[PDB]
Design a protein around this ligand. Structure first.
Ligand SMILES: CCCCCCCCCCCCCCCCCC(=O)OC[C@H](CO[C@@H]1O[C@H](CO[C@H]2O[C@H](CO)[C@H](O)[C@H](O)[C@H]2O)[C@H](O)[C@H](O)[C@H]1O)OC(=O)CCCCCCCCCCCCCCCCC
Ligand code: CLA
Ligand code: CLA
Ligand code: CLA
Ligand code: CLA
Ligand code: CLA
Ligand SMILES: CCCCCCCCCCCCCCCCCC(=O)OC[C@H](CO[C@@H]1O[C@H](CO)[C@H](O)[C@H](O)[C@H]1O)OC(=O)CCCCCCCCCCCCCCCCC
Ligand SMILES: CCCCCCCCCCCCCCCC(=O)OC[C@H](COP(=O)(O)OC[C@@H](O)CO)OC(=O)CCCCCCCCCCCCCCC
Ligand SMILES: CC1=C(/C=C/C(C)=C/C=C/C(C)=C/C=C/C=C(C)/C=C/C=C(C)/C=C/C2=C(C)CCCC2(C)C)C(C)(C)CCC1
Ligand SMILES: CC1=C(/C=C/C(C)=C/C=C/C(C)=C/C=C/C=C(C)/C=C/C=C(C)/C=C/C2=C(C)CCCC2(C)C)C(C)(C)CCC1
Ligand SMILES: CC1=C(/C=C/C(C)=C/C=C/C(C)=C/C=C/C=C(C)/C=C/C=C(C)/C=C/C2=C(C)CCCC2(C)C)C(C)(C)CCC1
Ligand code: OEX
Ligand SMILES: [Cl-]
Ligand SMILES: [Cl-]
Ligand SMILES: [Fe+2]
Lengths: 82, 62, 36, 30, 37, 341, 334, 34, 451
């Protein structure tokens, strides 16, 4: 039988459905795009840009080696790139 | 004659693209069968002509 | 309420995934991750 | 260039669905 | 390379080989149109 | 009618997607394991914990992205967003591995919720709960591999990371360090999994090729009505065929479908046990008698000794990069190598 | 009638306890040869020079193996793809040293198992069945052809065929990973999906049909006695099984047509194992798994390792140690 | 006479809208240069 | 709707081409239209390859599979396989592409506009699958066409410029064939060679005279058998042995094509005569041998006596004996000693590699070919990283021998399955139980119990 909701086949063919979603789907796509292109996603998540994996002349990875001084080790590593 | 070959060749491309769409549409619409059994006829011969034309010209450019 | 025929929404939807995925395979050869 | 290649294949790619489209409009023999 | 006469068609020539797989996809567009009867 | 009973009514309403009481636990935790994995494979690095790129943002593709394990120096920390290590700082939480524990722990509870849901729906519809029972084997596997195994080791670092190639590395680590192929508990698990694939295929094919002709068309799918009383294929002809092809054959449809449950469920349980052992480095690594012979007899060689040499290559060639916190420095001259290569 | 027709009706008799069939005329002698040779070699064969370097590998129980380490060892690299029947050896002693039993066993075996598949077709025809069980068997059969025949062809030696042993199988897998990165290969990923999903769907289907057995017995007896062999009615409520499984996910993720359901169970493992057999068969021609070694570099061009690079480090340990005495030149090209 | 906002509505939107957002993000990543 | 739906045809949409089994005209259309797709691809692909072709790079570094087939026929190529004229590649390309348009037109006409069945338009072009006479006649006409094509290859070798002959004195060159081999002891000797190592069945053909000679036999044999089948009808033993239906004939051809796919796989992987390594890159065996040659040369240059250099195992580091005593390259390449190639054979003596010729007669062009071939071994990754599986990114290379072998093994395997599928179905269908078991006369119920 039918649990009562509106058939999907019916909604995706309706014009109201595509009136609403002609704007919302690209709007979300463009937001996601801007999340990355503005550079915001590097800074929310702490992900290195291609210039900030290593100091210019260093060849060693900023590996955190202490549990409770951990947040502090990462902050020191990042300042050492300036 | 350079630009004359490139005209003959894009003539061929355009006519193929038209023929690619209209031959199957024409064939499966019988309402206008006789309407069109000369259009594909004349298209076909036109098409063949350009191939021959582009084939001879090739030698005065390539 | 049915106005737009399903096969057309399928073809369009389909072509839309092809583009996005194609783009990802392009990106495998360009920019980050491309070995170059 | 790549816009050249892509506009070619955009046009070739729509050529198929178009046939289908025009034959369903003109109530053809699909 | 193609001969220089035909060079303008390089972008068209680059994409022609994919066309037979469009026929395969076109059959499915076609069946969706007649609803897979 | 109390407030508990009214709530109960709404939770168990027949809707497109059943909620239930189990849903309160299932839907938040599943959505958040899922969500967290997508978020981290899309946006998060493994640079500070592993020295690795691991996100699309960084140039990884679907095969190489991962939500990697926390650094070994975190021990078995819960790595709470508000705990001593991140101190409420979301960005530094991500850089320290918190999405790994985030995903692992919400995944544990989402799995609980899914089994509870299996129980819940079985009770309401009126069927025996054998599907819930069968789902115990995947829970056994998730718990043994993702939780128990790291808890016996030095830290969560050595658990599997959530990505395709990351899991492949786990496979190769388990060969090189544990000789896991030699383990009878993994061998039973292979038997159970390969045997379940076998039973899947042979059962489906057998039914499909002993159908009765219950319609007139060439597509035989349309000649089945789920309300029909009658068996759709011939047990009798299927039994004869296999008796004469293979010597034995099922004769009891109930036994047959219980066996189908039994085989893979049992396989996965057995492999779970083997991994609990490996939590402790309690391996089936060696055969002492072969080692005593080989050490004395330089002309004695088997596939068992050949494979230990491969293990020895894996450990030494992969350890420095794979366990970076150890600071392994192996000069060229100590790396084990055969001739030329 | 005459003796030939008498023989023909016996061969294709449907009243034989094991069906013989024309395929069985070939299958029985080849399977017997291969089985007798394999059992004797696994117990008693002396050490075999698999890699052609005068370094015999002991595979048999009497020469110091157990059940897990024992094997019948592949024939020598010196032989490559040459055919080495017993009668080409100058003595059985020679034949044993150079791995002759492996060739005898696998050829008789591939031949017999091909006829096993044909014989599946044959009996289905004599019984009036649909014919495609043998097509399901082609997936394991193809897999065997890959590790015993195709991979040696592509690599130029039966010495790189899979050993006939438990530990020999592992050796073959580890060496394959090093030389081909099979784990990074999508046909093997499809193989895993095929067998994981097959085990899933096996357990699922068994659990769902078992969850919906109709009460036909008391609590003190096996519910298996609620089914009588050849009974006309079904012994479970497929509508109940659908109603549980539709609610567990949602209604349309669930099958209510048994035929479609059972065809999905056949098709899912068979296809995946087709693909993984094809992976062995194309890696036999060195079209190997994806290579992302140093694919990520930073603004300077430092290599930023990924998990693929860590896999490569384990691959490399496999590569440099396997067949540690067999390479004189820097590249291992087969 | 159907609802529009249902439990199902929430289900398909809690997946769908994040998915499109994420894709636009990933699309943009293919143009990042080192 | 003439068939075209499940109720009238009995076949569902996913099996819809089985609706054409008794519509000879629409069926004809599908075959011609699909022939159009094959000729289209040979056309578009050659032009694609040409647009992407850089004549200074080896063909096999550029991903080319069709231009090497044309080069091998003698067009466009000079000594050493150098490309001297690319015009013929253009022509081959354009002509197939143009022709696909007329195969296209004719297929679509027959499938859509044309008469759906041919048997009332004309008793010649129309056929019943069960008419054994008609079917062997059509078989006969296609046999004739095929024999003709085999002789077009002869025409090209003997009268129209010749063929590329990797074995030709001077490092390879196009050469007219004047003395093709007719002796049936050679031609059919090949058929009776064992397929195993050192023998190779027909994959072992290693000279153009044998190639051209065999196509003279095959052409004549196909033309004669065409005529046979036109004038004959199947004998009684053949009538009793086969199923006579459309699906069954389909299944016989899938078996054959499967068989042919597997042989092609091995041809491209082992044969360096009709798949010249100048165009397709070295064979697996060839690259491996070329590596041993390379380091023999290097070490010999440094002062090593390579004939007496005992390696770690006690076997020669550079040279050893095959199991029949031939001198061969040592190391793992021992397995590949059956290899034979123009760059190597000058070092061959009656007992195998000749140590005097190794010490004295290696030319720089052999050193050159051996290094080129070792560094283009057919090993590489799916995303076309060249080398062993542990190599780093850099070289963008997979051998066309790998591409052609892998692709044709996959196709051949799936056509074997298709054989089994349709063969089992054609038998079931002809006996009348392909749609399931008749509940009112189930065969097993009338058989005695097994025990
Ligand atoms: C119905 C049919 C009934 C058939 C029943 C009996 C069938 C017997 C077939 C056995 C074949 C298997 C062994 C093949 C081993 C091998 O070395 O085969 C390869 C040989 C080629 O041999 C190689 O041939 C070479 C020829 O090259 C020589 O010549 C060349 C000339 O240019 C070069 O110079 C080259 O360097 C030089 O060495 C050399 O001789 C090599 O030593 C030699 O190994 O190929 C061949 O003859 C081509 C075909 C081989 C068959 C392909 C395998 C079959 C696939 C089964 C599919 C799986 C089934 C799925 C089930 C589900
Ligand atoms: C596309 C190719 C093709 C096909 C499909 C056929 C198909 C057929 N032929 Mg024709 N034929 C062909 C080409 C072809 N032929 C050519 C080129 C010639 C000229 C030589 C002939 C000459 C010919 C004759 C003389 C006869 C047929 C007959 C037949 C029918 C029975 C075939 C049969 O039993 O299979 C083959 C099945 C067998 C059981 C034969 C034995 C096969 C064994 C097991 C294998 C080993 C021997 C094998 C023949 C070849 C050895 C190859 C080896 C060295 C590798 C069938 C309609 C027969 C008929 O009815 O005539 C009207 C018949 O008597 N054909
Ligand atoms: C079913 C829902 C559910 C469940 C089981 C979990 C479970 C968890 N989450 Mg997740 N979480 C959820 C929903 C859920 N979360 C939602 C909806 C979000 C979005 C906001 C998040 C966001 C989130 C984040 C951001 C993080 C977690 C974390 C955690 C972990 C630690 C939680 C903790 O310490 O709780 C502490 C709180 C309690 C245990 C609640 C106590 C309940 C009462 C007050 C106790 C006292 C009772 C009282 C005396 C008697 C009353 C009787 C009654 C009759 C009234 C744990 C695995 C952490 C994690 O994974 O880090 C590794 C983490 O960082 N969660
Ligand atoms: C090589 C591919 C191939 C070919 C050649 C065919 C050919 C055919 N099919 Mg099959 N089919 C295929 C693939 C193919 N099919 C696949 C993959 C599927 C599964 C999705 C099907 C499913 C299927 C079903 C379910 C049915 C067929 C049917 C048919 C026949 C009639 C179809 C019809 O009425 O068209 C009607 C369609 C149209 C009029 C729309 C336009 C189609 C034209 C041909 C497009 C041509 C465009 C092209 C660019 C040409 C222009 C270029 C110009 C220069 C020439 C026809 C002979 C039917 C049949 O058997 O008839 C009884 C049928 O019922 N097919
Ligand atoms: C026998 C068939 C065959 C073979 C051997 C090749 C081989 C090759 N092609 Mg070609 N090609 C073919 C058919 C074939 N192609 C067809 C039908 C098309 C049209 C779609 C093309 C279109 C084409 C283009 C446009 C290009 C190539 C290129 C190439 C080269 C690189 C291929 C690559 O990277 O794969 C990547 C691998 C895959 C995509 C894997 C596909 C796996 C399939 C889908 C799974 C199996 C499906 C089925 C069950 C079998 C290689 C030499 C390239 C080149 O270097 O040109 C010089 C190039 O750019 N080809
Ligand atoms: C093997 C393929 C094949 C077959 C068997 C048929 C068969 C048929 N077609 Mg089709 N047709 C085909 C291909 C095919 N056609 C192609 C490719 C096209 C497009 C050019 C057409 C276009 C077409 C149309 C437009 C019509 C037909 C018609 C017919 C019918 C009568 C034709 C006749 O008597 O010719 C007479 C034969 C001759 C005069 C002999 C000379 C033919 C040429 C010049 C010889 C070429 C030989 C060549 C060297 C072969 C190799 C070609 C290539 C591989 C290099 C018949 C049922 C007619 C029909 O059904 O009536 C309604 C019709 O109206 N066909
Ligand atoms: C229906 C029931 C039927 C089932 C019957 C079961 C079959 C039983 C299996 C027996 C198969 C082995 C018999 C081999 C005889 C050995 C002869 C010999 O001298 O080698 C015996 C030994 C074998 O090798 C030596 O084995 C010894 C153990 O006894 C020692 O360990 C030695 O170290 C070991 O090298 O080698 C030789 O003597 C060299 C002989 C070479 C030339 C003689 C030609 C022999 C022809 C062999 C053909 C056998 C093919 C078997 C086909 C039978 C099929 C029914
Ligand atoms: C067969 C193989 C199974 C795959 C499905 C095949 C569908 C094929 C099928 O027949 O059904 C398709 C079905 C059709 O719906 P309607 O009846 O509206 O449309 C009928 C049309 O087909 C008219 O022809 O649509 C779906 O169910 C939507 C699926 C998206 C569902 C999104 C819901 C999100 C749910 C979130 C997860 C739920 C909780 C999970 C448990 C925790
Ligand atoms: C050579 C040439 C030419 C020609 C061309 C042609 C021949 C074309 C064709 C074309 C075509 C041929 C195309 C087609 C296309 C198609 C498509 C585009 C489709 C797609 C599909 C889809 C997308 C699907 C979807 C779906 C459905 C529908 C249903 C089911 C589900 C799915 C989702 C799958 C020209 C003129 C240019 C000129 C130059 C040269
Ligand atoms: C039936 C059918 C079908 C099928 C179809 C087909 C298969 C078809 C084919 C078709 C075809 C097969 C077509 C073709 C066409 C082509 C063309 C159209 C061509 C043209 C060409 C040109 C135009 C060229 C030009 C040039 C030159 C000359 C030089 C260089 C450059 C260029 C390229 C520009 C389908 C499935 C869909 C559906 C159902 C029905
Ligand atoms: C060209 C060439 C050549 C030559 C070739 C030739 C001369 C060929 C031959 C070929 C042949 C001449 C083939 C044959 C084939 C055959 C077959 C493949 C058969 C089959 C059969 C069958 C299939 C049968 C079946 C059956 C039986 C047995 C019983 C009853 C049933 C039936 C009928 C089903 C050479 C190498 C020098 C070089 C290169 C080129
Ligand atoms: O043998 Mn068995 O394994 Ca195929 O690679 Mn080369 O060779 Mn030996 O090294 Mn790695
Ligand atoms: Cl090894
Ligand atoms: Cl070597
Ligand atoms: Fe079942």
């Amino acid at each position: 039988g039918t649990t009562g909701e509106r058939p999907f086949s019916d909604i995706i063919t309706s014009v109201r459905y595509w009136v609403i979603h002609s704007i919302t789907i690209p709007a979300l796509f463009i937001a996601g795009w801007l999340f990355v292109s503005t550079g915001l996603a590097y800074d929310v998540f702490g992900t290195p840009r291609p210039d900030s994996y290593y100091a210019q002349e260093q060849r060693s990875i900023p590996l955190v080696t202490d549990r409770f001084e951990a947040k502090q080790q990462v902050e020191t590593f990042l300042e050492q790139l300036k | 004659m350079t630009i004359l070959f490139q005209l003959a060749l894009a003539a061929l491309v355009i006519l193929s693209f038209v023929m690619v769409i209209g031959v199957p549409v024409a064939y499966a619409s019988p309402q206008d069968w006789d309407r069109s059994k000369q259009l594909i006829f004349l298209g076909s011969g036109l098409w063949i002509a350009l191939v021959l034309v582009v084939g001879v010209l090739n030698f005065f450019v390539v | 309420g049915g106005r737009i025929p399903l096969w057309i929404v399928a073809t369009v939807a389909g072509m839309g995934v092809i583009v996005i995925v194609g783009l990802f395979f392009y990106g495998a050869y360009a920019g980050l991750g491309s070995s170059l | 260039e790549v816009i050249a290649q892509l506009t070619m294949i955009a046009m070739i790619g729509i050529a198929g669905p178009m046939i289908i489209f025009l034959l369903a409009v003109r109530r053809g023999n699909l | 390379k193609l001969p220089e006469a035909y060079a303008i068609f390089d972008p068209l020539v680059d994409v022609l080989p994919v066309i037979p797989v469009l026929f395969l996809a076109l059959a499915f567009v076609w069946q969706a149109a007649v609803g897979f009867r | 009618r109390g407030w508990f009973d009214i709530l109960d009514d709404w939770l168990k309403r027949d809707r497109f997607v059943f909620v239930g009481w189990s849903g309160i636990l299932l839907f938040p935790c599943a959505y958040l394991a899922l969500g967290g994995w997508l978020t981290g494979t899309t946006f998060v690095t493994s640079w500070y914990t592993h020295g690795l790129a691991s996100s699309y943002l960084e140039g990884c593709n679907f095969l190489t992205v991962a939500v990697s394990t926390p650094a070994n120096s975190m021990g078995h920390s819960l790595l709470l967003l508000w705990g001593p290590e991140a101190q409420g700082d979301f960005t530094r939480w991500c850089q320290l591995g918190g999405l790994w524990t985030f995903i692992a722990l919400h995944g544990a509870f989402g799995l609980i919720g899914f089994m509870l849901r299996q129980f819940e729906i079985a009770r309401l519809v009126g069927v025996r709960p054998y599907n819930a029972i069968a789902f115990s084997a995947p829970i056994a596997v998730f718990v043994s591999v993702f939780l128990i195994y790291p808890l016996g080791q030095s830290s969560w670092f050595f658990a599997p990371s959530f990505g395709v190639a990351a899991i492949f590395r786990f496979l190769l680590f388990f060969q090189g360090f544990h000789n896991w192929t030699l383990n009878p508990f993994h061998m039973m698990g292979v038997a159970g999994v390969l045997g379940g694939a076998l039973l899947c295929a042979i059962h489906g094919a057998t039914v499909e090729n002993t159908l009765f002709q219950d319609g007139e068309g060439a597509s035989t799918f349309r000649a089945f009505n789920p309300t029909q009383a009658e068996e759709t294929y011939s047990m009798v002809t299927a039994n004869r065929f296999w008796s004469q092809i293979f010597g034995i054959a099922f004769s009891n449809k109930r036994w047959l479908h219980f066996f189908m449950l039994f085989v893979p469920v049992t396989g996965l349980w057995m492999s779970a046990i083997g991994v609990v052992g490996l939590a402790l480095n309690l391996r089936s690594y060696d055969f002492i008698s072969q080692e005593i012979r080989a050490a004395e007899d330089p002309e004695f060689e088997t596939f068992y000794t050949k494979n230990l040499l491969l293990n020895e290559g894996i450990r030494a060639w992969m350890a420095p990069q794979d366990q970076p916190h150890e600071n392994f420095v192996f000069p060229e001259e100590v790396l084990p190598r055969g001739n030329a290569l | 009638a005459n003796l030939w027709e008498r023989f023909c009706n016996w061969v294709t008799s449907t009243d034989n306890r094991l069906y013989v069939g024309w395929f069985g005329v070939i299958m029985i002698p080849t399977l017997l040869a291969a089985t007798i040779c394999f059992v004797i070699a696994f117990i008693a064969a002396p050490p075999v020079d698999i890699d052609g370097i005068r370094e015999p590998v002991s595979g048999s129980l009497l020469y110091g193996n157990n059940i897990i380490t024992g094997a019948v060892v592949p024939s020598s690299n010196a032989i490559g793809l040459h055919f080495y029947p017993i009668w080409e050896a100058a003595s059985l002693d020679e034949w044993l040293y150079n791995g002759g039993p492996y060739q005898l066993i696998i050829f008789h075996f591939l031949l017999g198992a091909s006829c096993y598949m044909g014989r599946q077709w044959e009996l289905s025809y004599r019984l009036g069945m649909r014919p495609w069980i043998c097509v399901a068997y082609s997936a394991p059969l193809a897999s065997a052809f890959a590790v015993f025949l195709i991979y040696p062809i592509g690599q130029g030696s039966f010495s790189d065929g899979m050993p006939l042993g438990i530990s020999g199988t592992f050796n073959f897998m580890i060496v394959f990973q090093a030389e081909h990165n099979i784990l990074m290969h999508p046909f093997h990923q499809l193989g895993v999906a095929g067998v994981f999903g097959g085990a899933l769907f096996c357990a699922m289907h068994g659990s769902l049909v078992t969850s919906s057995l109709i009460r036909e017995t008391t609590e003190t007896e096996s519910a298996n006695y609620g089914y009588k062999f050849g009974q006309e009615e079904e012994t479970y409520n497929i509508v109940a099984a659908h109603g549980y499984f539709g609610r567990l996910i949602f209604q349309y993720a669930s099958f209510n047509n048994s035929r479609s359901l059972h065809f999905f169970l056949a098709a899912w493992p068979v296809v995946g194992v087709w693909f993984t057999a094809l992976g062995i068969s194309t890696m036999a021609f060195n079209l190997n798994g994806f290579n992302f070694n140093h694919s990520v570099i930073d603004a300077k061009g430092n290599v930023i390792n990924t998990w693929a690079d860590i896999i490569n480090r384990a691959n490399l340990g496999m590569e440099v140690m396997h067949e540690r005495n067999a390479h004189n030149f820097p590249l291992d090209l087969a | 006479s159907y609802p529009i906002f249902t439990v199902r509505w929430v289900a398909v939107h809690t997946l769908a809208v994040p998915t499109i957002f994420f894709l636009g993000a990933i699309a943009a990543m293919q143009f990042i240069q080192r | 709707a003439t068939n075209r739906d499940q109720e009238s045809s009995g076949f569902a949409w996913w099996a819809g081409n089985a609706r054409l089994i008794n519509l000879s005209g629409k069926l004809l259309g599908a075959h011609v239209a699909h022939a159009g797709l094959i000729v289209f691809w040979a056309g578009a692909m050659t032009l694609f390859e040409l647009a992407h072709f850089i004549p200074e790079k080896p063909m096999y570094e550029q991903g080319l599979i069709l231009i090497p087939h044309i080069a091998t026929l003698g067009w466009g190529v000079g000594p050493g396989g150098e490309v001297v004229d690319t015009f013929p590649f253009f022509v081959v390309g354009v002509v197939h592409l143009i022709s696909s348009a007329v195969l296209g037109f004719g297929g679509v006409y027959h499938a859509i506009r044309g008469p759906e069945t041919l048997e009332e338009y004309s008793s010649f072009f129309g056929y019943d699958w069960k008419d054994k006479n008609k079917m062997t006649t059509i078989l006969g006409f296609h046999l004739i066409v095929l024999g003709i094509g085999a002789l077009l290859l002869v025409a090209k070798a003997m009268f129209f410029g010749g063929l590329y002959d990797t074995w030709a004195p001077g490092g390879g060159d196009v050469r007219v064939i004047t003395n093709p081999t007719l002796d049936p002891r050679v031609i059919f000797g090949y058929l009776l060679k064992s397929p195993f190592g050192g023998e190779g069945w027909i994959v072992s053909v290693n000279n153009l005279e044998d190639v051209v000679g065999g196509h003279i036999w095959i052409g004549l044999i196909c033309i004669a058998g065409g005529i046979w089948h036109i004038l004959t009808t199947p004998f009684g033993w053949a009538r009793r042995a086969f199923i006579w239906s459309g699906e069954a004939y389909l299944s016989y051809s899938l078996g054959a094509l499967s068989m042919m796919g597997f042989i092609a796989t091995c041809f491209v992987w082992f044969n360096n005569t009709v798949y010249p390594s100048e165009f397709y890159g070295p064979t697996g065996p060839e690259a491996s041998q070329a590596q041993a040659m390379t380091f023999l040369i290097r070490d010999q240059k440094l002062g090593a006596n390579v004939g007496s250099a005992q390696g770690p195992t006690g076997l020669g580091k550079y040279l050893m004996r095959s199991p029949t005593g031939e001198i061969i390259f040592g190391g793992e390449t021992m397995r590949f000693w059956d290899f034979r190639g123009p760059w190597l054979e000058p070092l061959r003596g009656p007992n195998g590699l000749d140590l005097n010729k190794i010490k004295n007669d290696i030319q720089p062009w052999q050193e050159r070919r051996a290094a080129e071939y070792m560094t283009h071994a057919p090993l590489g990754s799916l995303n076309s990283v060249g080398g062993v599986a542990t190599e780093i990114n850099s070289v963008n290379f997979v051998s066309p021998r790998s591409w052609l072998a892998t692709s044709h093994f996959v196709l051949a395997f799936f056509f074997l399955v298709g054989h089994l599928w349709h063969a089992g179905r054609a038998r079931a269908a002809a006996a009348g139980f392909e749609k399931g078991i008749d509940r009112e006369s189930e065969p097993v119920l009338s058989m005695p119990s097994l025990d």
